Every structure is written in C-alpha cells, then in structure tokens.
Amino acid sequence: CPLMVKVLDAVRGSPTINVAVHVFRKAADDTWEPFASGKTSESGELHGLTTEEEFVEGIYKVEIDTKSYWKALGISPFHEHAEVVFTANDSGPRRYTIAALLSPYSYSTTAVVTNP
Amino acid sequence: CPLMVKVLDAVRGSPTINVAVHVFRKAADDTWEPFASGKTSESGELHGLTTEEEFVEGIYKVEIDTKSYWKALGISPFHEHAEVVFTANDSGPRRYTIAALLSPYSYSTTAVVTN
Amino acid sequence: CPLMVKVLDAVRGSPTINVAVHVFRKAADDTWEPFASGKTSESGELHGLTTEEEFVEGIYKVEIDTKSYWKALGISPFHEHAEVVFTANDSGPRRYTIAALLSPYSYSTTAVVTNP
Amino acid sequence: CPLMVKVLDAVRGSPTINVAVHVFRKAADDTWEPFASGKTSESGELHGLTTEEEFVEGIYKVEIDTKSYWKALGISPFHEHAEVVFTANDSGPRRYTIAALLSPYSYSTTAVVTN
Ligand SMILES: N[C@@H](Cc1cc(I)c(Oc2cc(I)c(O)c(I)c2)c(I)c1)C(=O)O
Numbered sequence: 001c002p003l004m005v006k007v008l009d010a011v012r013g014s015p016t017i018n019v020a021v022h023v024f025r026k027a028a029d030d031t032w033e034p035f036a037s038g039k040t041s042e043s044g045e046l047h048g049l050t051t052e053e054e055f056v057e058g059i060y061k062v063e064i065d066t067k068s069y070w071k072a073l074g075i076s077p078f079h080e081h082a083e084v085v086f087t088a089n090d091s092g093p094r095r096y097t098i099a100a101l102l103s104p105y106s107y108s109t110t111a112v113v114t115n116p
Numbered sequence: 117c118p119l120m121v122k123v124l125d126a127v128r129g130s131p132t133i134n135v136a137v138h139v140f141r142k143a144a145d146d147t148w149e150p151f152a153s154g155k156t157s158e159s160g161e162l163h164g165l166t167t168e169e170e171f172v173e174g175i176y177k178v179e180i181d182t183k184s185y186w187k188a189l190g191i192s193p194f195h196e197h198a199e200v201v202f203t204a205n206d207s208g209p210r211r212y213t214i215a216a217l218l219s220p221y222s223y224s225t226t227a228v229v230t231n
Numbered sequence: 232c233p234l235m236v237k238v239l240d241a242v243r244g245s246p247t248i249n250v251a252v253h254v255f256r257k258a259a260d261d262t263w264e265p266f267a268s269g270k271t272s273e274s275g276e277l278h279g280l281t282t283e284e285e286f287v288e289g290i291y292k293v294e295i296d297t298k299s300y301w302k303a304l305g306i307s308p309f310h311e312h313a314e315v316v317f318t319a320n321d322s323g324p325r326r327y328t329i330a331a332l333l334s335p336y337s338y339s340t341t342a343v344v345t346n347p
Numbered sequence: 348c349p350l351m352v353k354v355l356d357a358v359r360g361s362p363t364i365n366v367a368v369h370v371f372r373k374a375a376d377d378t379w380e381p382f383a384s385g386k387t388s389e390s391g392e393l394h395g396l397t398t399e400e401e402f403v404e405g406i407y408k409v410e411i412d413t414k415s416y417w418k419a420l421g422i423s424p425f426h427e428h429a430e431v432v433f434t435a436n437d438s439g440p441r442r443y444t445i446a447a448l449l450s451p452y453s454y455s456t457t458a459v460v461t462n
Pocket residue numbers: 008099100101108109110112237239328330331332339340341343453
C-alpha cells in the first residue's frame with residue numbers, strides 16, 4: 001500500500017463515504033495517463049490503489065470528486081474537485097497518504113510521507 | 117493598527133460578519149485579563165483593537181465566538197470558540213493579522229506578521 | 232477509546248512524535264480541572280486518554296504543546312499551543328478524534344465524531 | 348476586479364511575494380486555455396487579472412506555482428503547484444478572491460465570494 005487517500009467532511013465532522021478518486025501519471029509526452037481510481041470506504045479511506053511494482057517514480061495527480069459529494073448533500077460547492085499534483089518516489093520508494101479536508105468553499109490537502 | 121483580526125466562513129465562502137472577538141493579556145498571576153474586544157465588520161475584519169503604545173510584549177489570547185456564529189446560521193458546530201494564544205513582539209513591534217477560517221467541525225488560524 | 236488525538240507536521244509531511252497533550256474538563260465552579268494527559272506516539276497518535284465511564288458529558292479542553300515541538304526542531308513558532316474547546320457527549324456517548332495539522336505560523340484542528 | 352488571488356506562507360507568517368499565478372479557462376474541446384497571469388505583490392496579492400466584460404461564466408483554473416516558492420526558500424515541498432478549479436458566475440457576476448495558505452507538505456484554498 002504505497003498510496004492511500006483519506007477524505008473528511010469539515011461541516012459534519014465525519015469521514016466522506018463513496019467519494020470518487022482518480023489518479024493519473026504524467027506520460028513521456030507530457031499528457032496525463034489514467035493510473036488508478038476508486039471510491040472511499042465508510043472510514044473515508046481508499047486503500048489498494050496500486051502496488052510497489054506499479055508505483056514507479058513520476059509526477060502523479062490525484063483528483064477527488066468533491067463536487068458530486070457536496071451536490072448529493074444538497075450543497076452547491078465552489079470547487080469542481082480537490083486536486084493534488086506531486087513527484088513521487090524520486091529518492092526511492094515511499095509510502096504516501098493524501099488527506100483532504102473538505103468544506104463547500106474551502107479545502108485543504110496534506111501529504112504524510114513515510115519510509116516503508 | 118498593531119493587531120488586526122480577519123475571519124472567513126468556509127461553508128458560505130464569505131467574510132464572517134458580526135462575530136464577537138475578545139482579546140486577553142496574560143497577567144502576572146497567570147490569569148487572562150480582558151484587553152480588547154469588538155465585532156467583525158461586513159468585511160469580516162476587526163480593526164482598532166489596540167494601539168502601538170498599549171500593545172507591549174507579552175502573551176495574548178484572541179477568542180473568537182465561533183459557536184454563536186454557527187448558531188445564527190442554524191448549523192450545529194463542534195467547538196465552543198476558536199482561541200489563538202501567542203507571544204507578541206518577541207523580536208520587537210510588528211503588525212499582526214490573526215486570520216481564521218471557520219467550518220462547523222474545523223477551523224484554521226494563521227498569523228500574518230509584517231514589519 | 233472515546234477520545235483520540237492525532238497530530239501531523241505540515242512542514243515535514245510526517246506525524247508529530249512525542250508532542251505533549253493535556254485534556255481538562257470544566258468543573259461546576261467554571262474552572263478547568265485536569266482530566267488526562269499523554270504524548271503522541273511515532274504514528275502521531277495518542278490513544279487511551281480515557282474510558283467510556285470516565286468521559287461523561289461536559290466541556291473539555293485539549294491543549295497540544297506545539298511550541299515545544301517547533302522549538303525542538305529549531306523553529307520559533309507563532310502560537311503557544313493549539314487548543315480545542317468543545318462540548319462532549321451531550322446527545323449520548325460519542326467517539327471523538329481531534330486531528331491537528333501544524334505549521335510554524337498556522338494550525339488547523341478538525342473533529343471526527345462517530346457513534347460507537 | 349472580478350477576480351483576486353491572495354497567497355500566504357504558513358511557515359514564515361508572511362504574504363508570499365513574487366509567486367507566479369496562471370489562470371486558464373476550459374475551452375470547448377475541454378483543454379485549458381491560458382487566460383491571465385502575473386506575480387503576487389509584496390502583500391501577496393495579484394489584482395487586475397481580468398475585467399468584468401472578459402470574465403464570463405465558465406470553468407476556470409488558477410494554478411499557483413508553489414514549488415518555485417519553496418525552492419527559493421530552500422525547503423523541499425510536496426506539491427508541484429496548488430490548483431483551484433471552479434465554475435464561475437453560476438448565479439451571476441460576483442467578486443472572487445481565491446485565497447491560498449501554503450506549507451511545504453500542505454495547502455488550503457478558500458474562495459471568498461462577495462456581491
Ligand atoms: N484518521 C483520524 C481522523 C483524521 C486523520 C488525519 I491524518 C487527518 O488529517 C488532516 C488533514 C488535513 I488537509 C487537515 O487540515 C487536518 I486538521 C487533519 C484528519 I483532518 C483527520 C480518524 O478518523 O481516526
């Protein structure tokens with residue numbers, strides 16, 4: 001589990017359940033190639049996106065579909081998504097947790113990076 | 117204005133208007149002595165709390181009554197307030213802006229400290 | 232485990248290890264009475280502060296000693312501490328996770344509240 | 348000024364000065380068309396990006412080059428940038444301030460949307 005995503009709702013104080021998460025990797029030609037995707041569980045976590053073999057060094061993009069989340073709660077939010085773009089594994093393999101904290105007009109994202 | 121308070125609402129994307137702010141200074145006996153207070157304006161800002169002459173080095177607390185704000189909006193909040201406690205003018209006099217970003221179950225606070 | 236505290240360093244992208252956490256409960260006479268204390272583990276978590284029996288409804292204060300943390304890293308931070316003050320268990324027992332995200336001149340705190 | 352960008356540094360407690368900001372509008376083919384850009388001022392603010400006449404409804408991206416900022420300071424950052432993507436003027440024309448608070452491993456962004 002080299003890559004995990006954790007998402008929290010700052011309005012309700014609760015994990016964010018069934019939120020779509022897409023991950024992309026920058027290709028040689030500088031386009032984004034689909035890398036992996038999934039939905040958060042009831043703990044607001046998404047595990048198992050990738051493997052140590054698959055998760056090589058590169059620039060990755062994680063886009064969390066915060067708009068669908070807010071809309072399903074009856075709220076028209078400001079952002080289309082929360083996005084995190086980062087260089088991974090450039091000094092060797094690491095483990096990455098991407099945490100996002102969501103409000104209708106604000107979000108924050110944090111990375112927790114550990115050495116396996 | 118040595119000390120500036122700016123508050124925003126992360127749910128509505130708006131400044132937080134008319135929220136109470138109390139400033140305390142730590143007294144010798146280690147209790148909080150009320151120092152200054154007011155209400156945020158329509159721009160979410162509270163100016164004129166203190167003066168250069170009055171705002172000496174020491175430890176200060178800024179308490180924002182976030183719970184009354186969420187209560188006015190009909191949204192159940194987690195915190196009783198947001199309080200920011202800091203040592204002032206350690207390296208000399210500066211202009212301080214205490215910014216706070218509010219959500220019902222979360223807040224963040226940031227100090228912007230300039231010349 | 233009705234009360235857990237989790238603390239992250241936003242400069243280093245890492246859990247915050249050995250940070251002191253004090254919890255107080257407001258007494259009938261409106262003073263703060265020491266309730267519990269501990270230090271974060273290497274996962275930046277502090278478990279076992281209290282029990283369901285002990286953790287009755289009241290107004291609680293969690294103060295995290297962020298100043299000592301930053302100072303031990305050679306940084307002179309803005310805040311004396313990060314504090315969270317909240318009413319607990321007023322609609323029945325809940326489980327509370329208090330997460331704090333720390334930078335030298337900023338912090339955020341979030342509560343995740345679940346129904347056991 | 349329909350669109351305002353303000354950036355702060357949570358490590359130093361300061362506005363972030365001279366960081367590059369690029370604004371894009373989503374084109375019909377769904378690629379990002381560069382729209383406006385500049386550098387934040389000494390107050391960390393970028394004004395004058397667009398005008399009322401030019402800033403029509405649509406989907407916009409604001410990209411803040413946070414990685415060059417941390418690089419100038421000698422601090423290893425996590426993100427390549429901070430990017431904020433939003434639908435504009437859904438309910439009509441408004442004044443938008445995109446605020447961002449930066450740390451090496453974390454950022455937050457907030458929209459303040461007024462009359
Ligand atoms: N894991 C805990 C809850 C929890 C863990 C983390 I790690 C976390 O991380 C952040 C990220 C950002 I971005 C913030 O602004 C803040 I404050 C905390 C948050 I939130 C909540 C549990 O449910 O048991």
